[PDB]
Each structure stands twice: as C-alpha cells, then as structure tokens.
C-alpha cells in the first residue's frame, strides 16, 4: 500500500483493522422465557412447535 500511495497522485489505497467485543443479553429475567411443545404419534413421527 505504501508503495502504491507514492506512485499514483490521484489513485490511493488503504488498510484498516477493527476489534469486536459484542455483549449478548436483555433487560430483565422475564425477557428470556422460552416455551415449546412436542408431539409423538403412533407411527414414529414428531411434530414440534
């Protein structure tokens, strides 16, 4: 890049690097409740929701 930036007056290049710390969470306890429901029929076969 630094060889390129000094051999072209109007055409430039560049480089960058950034870190990432992303927290995962919600407000209160009652914001994570998660339900589900599963059925199995007489022949082996399952219905989930």
């Amino acid at each position: 890049v630094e060889k390129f930036n000094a051999e072209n007056y109007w055409k430039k290049k560049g480089l960058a690097m950034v870190p990432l710390k992303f927290p995962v969470g919600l407000g209160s306890r009652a914001a994570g409740q998660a339900a589900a429901l599963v059925h199995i029929y007489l022949d082996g076969s399952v219905l989930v929701t």
Binding site: Y41, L42, D43, S45
Partner: protein, 49 residues
C-alpha cells in the same frame, strides 16, 4: 330383535385441503374419532402421520 338406524340429523360432511408444500393435508371432518381419519389418510397417501 331387529336392528336400528342412527338418523343423526347432520349428514356426513367433510372437507380435505392439500397444502402444496410438504404434502401437508388438512382434513376438516365432523367425525367422532380423528385418530382413525388421520391414520387412514396417512396410509392411503403413503405419508407419515
């Protein structure tokens, strides 16, 4: 002793709806025993219940 006829006032009414995706089959039927209906439709269509 001779037999009888039920003479339930409502006659045998039903509707069957294909879904167009995943061979899903709704069966709206005014029966007493939905398990048989589901089983026989599954066996007739060659489908898991």
């Amino acid at each position: 002793m001779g037999g009888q006829e039920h003479f339930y006032m409502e006659t045998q009414s039903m509707l069957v709806v294909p879904k167009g995706e995943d061979q899903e089959m709704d069966v709206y039927v005014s029966t007493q025993f939905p398990k048989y209906i589901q089983d026989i439709v599954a066996s007739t269509l060659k489908l898991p219940a």
